[PDB]
Amino acid sequence: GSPREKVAMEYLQSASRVLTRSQLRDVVASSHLLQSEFMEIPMNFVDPKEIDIPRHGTKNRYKTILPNPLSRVCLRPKNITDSLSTYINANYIRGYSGKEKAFIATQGPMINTVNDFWQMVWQEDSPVIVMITKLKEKNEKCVLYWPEKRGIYGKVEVLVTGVTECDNYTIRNLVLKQGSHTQHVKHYWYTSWPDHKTPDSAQPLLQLMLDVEEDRLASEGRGPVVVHCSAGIGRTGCFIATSIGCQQLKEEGVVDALSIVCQLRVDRGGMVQTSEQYEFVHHALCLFESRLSPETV
């Protein structure tokens, strides 16, 4: 929601700036007009008066960054009544062309939400988790929520079967279990995002992006890809917007980043949280465009 509700939602649902590949290259060259464009996009943060689940604040890492009701991920453990047991700071995110539930954006788990997080990964049959933050960056950003080899979290067991190092991220193959059932999940941990600025190069992110895309292509029938950083909106929003925009560039030869970010704001308030992040998404789109086959006919 926003102070002027209709003005803000009308904007989010109508703003558009379709960029040809040439225009995309020019826009980043002019990293000045992106800032004013960014400032025009409503945050769509959730008015706490809206949501009504007593003490949900205990499970929010950032008190003002909440899951918009319409797309909130509700937990369904088959045996709890704590009410807060059905709550998690996470939202379903629409993908390219509005594809329903392509991703789930969520905050970095807190000690008291680790079980909830796995309950989500389990009930949603999520095939991939993308983590874009260190556990600490000057101050706490996220809690360690997975085991070195094996762990129990509520009624969900997580087994770490393998670990592979890469560019600026590490991949952990995971196996989740509940009784007679198993679920595979690949955990990507991107640790090199700078503490005080956006990545100098978008190459590591696009590599991660491509790896996750191959996972999605082979996981038809499964659930949304889970993405989180600390508050679950900044780096998280950058990763998702970049993924959606690179697909538009590849399939259509153009990209509407403004529309993409607006739709993300609709799904989760604050997605792509700073102007620097907004510029970074465009730089990442530019790097991707630089690798496409030529337009000259």
Curated annotation (Swiss-Prot):
Binding site for substrate: D195, C229, S230, A231, G232, I233, G234, R235, Q273
UniProt note on tissues of expression: Expressed in the heart, brain, spleen, lung, liver, skeletal muscle, kidney and testis. Isoform alpha is expressed throughout the granular layer of the cerebellar but not within the Purkinje cells, also in the villi of the ileum and jejunum and both the villi and crypts of the duodenum. Isoform beta is expressed only in the Purkinje cells. Isoform gamma is expressed throughout the brain, the villi and crypts of the duodenum, jejunum and ileum and expressed at low levels in the proximal colon.
Segments forming a coiled coil: none
Active-site positions on this chain: C229 (phosphocysteine intermediate)
Residue intervals of the Tyrosine-protein phosphatase domain: 34-288
Top-level taxon in the UniProt lineage: Eukaryota
Membrane side Cytoplasmic: residue ranges: 3-297
Function of the molecule: Sequesters mitogen-activated protein kinases (MAPKs) such as MAPK1, MAPK3 and MAPK14 in the cytoplasm in an inactive form. The MAPKs bind to a dephosphorylated kinase interacting motif, phosphorylation of which by the protein kinase A complex releases the MAPKs for activation and translocation into the nucleus. Isoform gamma may have a role in patterning and cellular proliferation of skeletal elements in the precartilaginous/cartilaginous skeleton.
Subunit-structure text: Interacts with MAPKs.
UniProt similarity note: Belongs to the protein-tyrosine phosphatase family. Receptor class 7 subfamily.
Name of this chain's protein: Receptor-type tyrosine-protein phosphatase R
Source organism: Mus musculus
Entire-sequence positions represented here: 361 to 655 of 656
